[PDB]
Structures are given as C-alpha cells and as structure tokens.
Design a protein around this ligand. Structure first.
Ligand SMILES: C[C@H](CCC(=O)NCCC[N+](C)(C)CCCS(=O)(=O)[O-])[C@H]1CC[C@H]2[C@@H]3[C@H](O)C[C@@H]4C[C@H](O)CC[C@]4(C)[C@H]3C[C@H](O)[C@]12C
Ligand SMILES: C[C@H](CCC(=O)NCCC[N+](C)(C)CCCS(=O)(=O)[O-])[C@H]1CC[C@H]2[C@@H]3[C@H](O)C[C@@H]4C[C@H](O)CC[C@]4(C)[C@H]3C[C@H](O)[C@]12C
Ligand SMILES: C[C@H](CCC(=O)NCCC[N+](C)(C)CCCS(=O)(=O)[O-])[C@H]1CC[C@H]2[C@@H]3[C@H](O)C[C@@H]4C[C@H](O)CC[C@]4(C)[C@H]3C[C@H](O)[C@]12C
Ligand SMILES: C[C@H](CCC(=O)NCCC[N+](C)(C)CCCS(=O)(=O)[O-])[C@H]1CC[C@H]2[C@@H]3[C@H](O)C[C@@H]4C[C@H](O)CC[C@]4(C)[C@H]3C[C@H](O)[C@]12C
Ligand SMILES: C[C@H](CCC(=O)NCCC[N+](C)(C)CCCS(=O)(=O)[O-])[C@H]1CC[C@H]2[C@@H]3[C@H](O)C[C@@H]4C[C@H](O)CC[C@]4(C)[C@H]3C[C@H](O)[C@]12C
Ligand SMILES: Nc1ncnc2c1ncn2[C@@H]1O[C@H](CSCC[C@H](N)C(=O)O)[C@@H](O)[C@H]1O
Ligand code: SF4
Ligand code: FES
Ligand SMILES: [Cl-]
Ligand SMILES: [Cl-]
Length: 346
C-alpha cells in the first residue's frame, strides 16, 4: 500500500522493492505525501536557505556527440560561440556584484580552454571570495588536478543514466565506466562532487530509475542534478517523448529522502517543461537554483534542449528574479557559499 511505502521511507528502509513501488504508484494522495515528506526532510536538514549558483555557459563548442544534446558535434544548425577569458572573468565579477556566492562555469567539451585557460579563469574568479563550480565534462585526471590546484571547489558531472548499456548507446564517445571513473577521481581530489540523471530517456525503464537512486545513495554525492529529458529537433532523438514532470519530481523527492543533507538544484529543465516547475521542485526537496548568467548574444545559442526559459530576458534579469522567487516561496537567500553541511547519522 501507499501508506506502507511511506512508512518504510520514513523508517529509512530503502530497499529496491520500496523505491520501485514509490516510483510505480500513481495515486495523487501518495504522490502529495511523498512530496510533503521530501519538503520536510529538506527543511529539517538543509533549512530554508536557497543557494544561488550563477551559471555562465561560456562556450557551446563540443567534441562529443551525445544523442540527446543540442550541442552534439554533428549539429550543423547551430552558431557556435566562445567567450574570451576576459569576458568570462568580468561577467563573473558582475554576478558577484549582484550577490552571487557561487559561480558555475559550464560548457560543451571544448578543447580550446583545456586545461590552462580554465585554470587562469578560476584563479581570477577565486580572488573575488566566492565558490567556483566547474561543469566541463570528461577530462584526464591531470586536468581535474590542475583545476583543483587553481582553486575550483566543486564539479558537476551528471551520471546521466546508471544503465551501462543505455549510457553507451546515448553517449557513443564514452561509457558509464568512464563517467563513474571521472566522478570517483573528482571525489578523490577533494571536489564537492555532483552527479544526477535525466528522467524519461528513450529506452529507460522504472527499474533504471531505481538503479539511478541506488547509485546516488551508494556514492553519497554532495550534489544531485535531476531533470526531464527534453527532445531537441536537431538531434537523433527529436521525435522521442519528453520526460514526465511528475515522475522527475518524484526522483527529486526520493533523492532528498535518500541523501537528506545533499545540495539538490531545481533545474532549468524542470522550469522549461512546466511553467513554474522550478518553484514546485524547490518545494519537493530541492534547495539550490542556477539563474542564467550567460550574456547576450550567446545565451540564445546554448541550446542543450529547446524552449529554454530566460533566453529572451535582459542579461542581468535572472539573479533579481530568483531573489524575488526565493522571497515569494517564503525562503531565504544563502548567506555563505552553500557548501554541503554533512549531518553524520546511523
Ligand atoms: C481549490 C481551487 C478552487 C476549486 C473550486 O472551484 N472550488 C482549485 C482551482 C484550481 C485548482 C488547481 C488546478 O486544478 C491545478 C492543479 C490540479 C491538481 O490535480 C491539483 C492541484 C492544482 C494546483 C489544483 C488545486 C485546487 O484544486 C485548485 C487551486
Ligand atoms: C496551493 C494548492 C491549492 C490549495 C488550495 O487551494 N486548497 C496546494 C494543493 C496541493 C499542494 C501541493 C501538495 O501538498 C504537494 C506538495 C507538498 C509540499 O510540502 C509543498 C509543495 C506541494 C507541491 C504542494 C503545494 C501547494 O500547497 C498545493 C499545490
Ligand atoms: C552592482 C550595482 C552597483 C554597486 C556594486 O558594485 N555593488 C557591489 C555589491 C557587492 N555585494 C554586496 C553584493 C557582495 C548594485 C547597485 C544596486 C544593487 C541591487 C540593489 O541593491 C537591489 C538588489 C539587492 C540584492 O541583495 C542583490 C540584487 C540587487 C538587484 C542588487 C544588485 C547589485 O548589487 C546592484 C545593482
Ligand atoms: C497545471 C499543470 C499542467 C498544465 C497543462 O496541462 N498544460 C497543457 C498540457 C500541471 C503539470 C504538472 C502538475 C503538478 C505535478 O503533477 C506535481 C504536483 C502533483 C500534486 O498532486 C498537485 C500539485 C502539483 C505541483 C501539480 C500541479 C499541476 O497539476 C501541474 C503543474
Ligand atoms: C530589486 C528587486 C525588485 C527585489 C525583488 C525581490 C527583492 C529581494 C526580496 O525582497 C528578499 C530580500 C528582501 C534583500 C532581498 C533578497 C531583496 C533584494 C531586492 O529588494 C529584490 C531582489
Ligand atoms: N535534451 C536534453 N534534455 C534535458 N537535459 C539535457 C539535454 N541535453 C543535455 N542535458 C543535460 O544537460 C547537462 C549539461 S551538458 C554541459 C556540461 C558537459 N558538456 C557535460 O556533458 O557534463 C547534461 O549533464 C545533461 O543531463
Ligand atoms: S551533454 Fe555535454 S558532452 Fe554531451 S554533447 Fe552535450 S555538451 Fe557535449
Ligand atoms: S530566473 Fe530567468 S527571469 Fe526568472
Ligand atoms: Cl544541475
Ligand atoms: Cl537544466
């Protein structure tokens, strides 16, 4: 029964059997109770602060060919861009002037910057007294070491799917084994490390989602980024179905329940598939948001998926907008860098 599954989640009996049933039950009452549980666990462990991570998507050049992604190298219907290191540093400075306590640098897997230009950029931003999070994909250990020495604090590297067969199909340049080895190296080097997956990929099952949750629990990641798959018209997956918002929201809720002290963003993909999706997600376990800080005229060219919200807004709009969002949600802005605050338990 739904009531029995909630009782087991409340007692932290996180068996495969319990997680599968939670994801399989579609009862509105059960779902609402699950979201309430996750919301309460979030409030108890990580409080009411919503941590703002200002994201600068500094290049849409990519060497990889992921089947879901609009930046895949085979996509010729996309104007490619690269911000200069001076542009990136000064754009980061502007975010810090607007109150950002974490700068996130994200790109396609663009060889041009790697590793030294990134190191130089990271060193300049670290002078501003903020946390730096990188999201640059898969690189050699030596690059990750150099970036950590340069001052990088965190690394976001979504594991995408924990099914190694699906992973290899969707990401033909690499493997789940590679992705996991990247994540383990990041952890070893002392990064606060973020993983997470997409929900509703072509061929992905409920059992795969259960494996995603068990994988996250196993490795105790500091951050978990979860969003729905959104098909992009300039990719091989163009005609496939979008991920379901409510199922994806259940994955966020379960992630909070399993990893109560983790940092969990309300992802832009959630706000893209449903108007107000990020706000809902912030009320179902999430405690982080990433306002878009990519400048014009490049913001519109960073199209991992279509319809992406905030593309049409003035450059500087998203930090003020999320501060208003945080207030109308009855939440507080983060006071410090919002690093993980571990609660050791049993
Ligand atoms: C309580 C009021 C007034 C009902 C009335 O007219 N009396 C009604 C009017 C519109 C209703 C919402 C929408 O339907 C969208 C959504 C559907 C979900 O399924 C349940 C949640 C949600 C948010 C609904 C909640 C509630 O039910 C609302 C606020
Ligand atoms: C505002 C509306 C309508 C209330 C009304 O008009 N009557 C009520 C009806 C059902 C409520 C949601 C559910 O509880 C699940 C979940 C619990 C979390 O804790 C907080 C988030 C969330 C999404 C709730 C938000 C909000 O509270 C809802 C939409
Ligand atoms: C950047 C410019 C010029 C002055 C400047 O360079 N200020 C550096 C401040 C550095 N921090 C204190 C944030 C660290 C200053 C002048 C007025 C400032 C806004 C208002 O106050 C309202 C609001 C308060 C929030 O709280 C943060 C967001 C927001 C929109 C502010 C952003 C920014 O800060 C503004 C634009
Ligand atoms: C109103 C929109 C649908 C808009 C629409 O239908 N656009 C055309 C297609 C739908 C899409 C997803 C729905 C929410 C999720 O289910 C999660 C959650 C379940 C709770 O039970 C009730 C509250 C909540 C937040 C739901 C409210 C509402 O129902 C949403 C926003
Ligand atoms: C400048 C724009 C308009 C308004 C909209 C919401 C306002 C924030 C919230 O009111 C909460 C809090 C008070 C301080 C802080 C973060 C405010 C700063 C500023 O006043 C904001 C950004
Ligand atoms: N079509 C799509 N729908 C939803 N999310 C997508 C998507 N395409 C890509 N993403 C998500 O966007 C994230 C950032 S991709 C940018 C960073 C780096 N190149 C990397 O691959 O890690 C990915 O991890 C993926 O989960
Ligand atoms: S998901 Fe990352 S690595 Fe894959 S094509 Fe997109 S930008 Fe490149
Ligand atoms: S956060 Fe982009 S304008 Fe609302
Ligand atoms: Cl994320
Ligand atoms: Cl996103």
């Amino acid at each position: 029964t739904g009531r029995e599954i909630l009782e087991k989640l409340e007692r932290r009996e996180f068996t495969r059997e319990v997680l599968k049933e939670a994801l399989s039950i579609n009862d509105r009452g059960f779902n609402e109770a699950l979201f309430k549980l996750a919301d309460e666990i979030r409030r108890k462990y990580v409080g009411d602060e919503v941590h703002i991570r200002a994201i600068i998507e500094f290049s849409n050049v990519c060497r990889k060919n992921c089947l879901y992604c609009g930046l895949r190298r085979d996509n010729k219907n996309l104007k490619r861009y690269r911000m200069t290191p001076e542009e990136i540093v000064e754009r980061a400075r502007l975010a810090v002037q607007f109150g950002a306590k974490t700068i996130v640098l994200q790109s396609g897997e663009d060889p041009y910057y790697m590793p030294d230009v990134i190191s130089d950029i990271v060193k300049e931003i670290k002078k501003m007294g903020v946390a730096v999070t990188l999201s640059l994909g898969e690189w050699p250990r030596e690059y990750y070491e150099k970036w950590k020495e340069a001052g990088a604090d965190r690394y976001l590297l979504r594991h995408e799917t924990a099914n190694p067969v699906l992973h290899r199909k969707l990401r033909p340049d690499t493997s789940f084994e590679n992705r996991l080895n990247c994540l383990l190296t990041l952890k070893e080097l002392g990064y606060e490390t973020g993983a997470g997956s997409m929900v509703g990929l072509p061929g992905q099952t409920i059992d795969d989602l259960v494996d995603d949750l068990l994988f996250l629990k196993e490795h105790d990641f500091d951050m978990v980024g979860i969003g729905p798959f959104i098909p992009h018209p300039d990719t091989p997956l163009a005609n496939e179905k979008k991920g379901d918002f409510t199922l994806t929201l259940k994955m966020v809720a379960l992630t909070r329940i399993l990893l109560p002290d983790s940092n969990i963003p309300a992802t832009t993909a959630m706000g893209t598939i449903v108007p107000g999706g990020r706000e809902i997600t912030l009320r179902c376990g999430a405690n982080v948001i990433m306002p878009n800080w990519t400048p014009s005229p490049y913001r519109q060219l960073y199209q991992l998926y279509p319809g992406k919200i905030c593309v049409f807004e003035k450059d500087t709009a998203c930090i003020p907008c999320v501060m208003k969002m945080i207030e109308l949600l009855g939440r507080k802005p983060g006071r410090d860098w919002g690093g993980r605050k571990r609660v050791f338990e049993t």
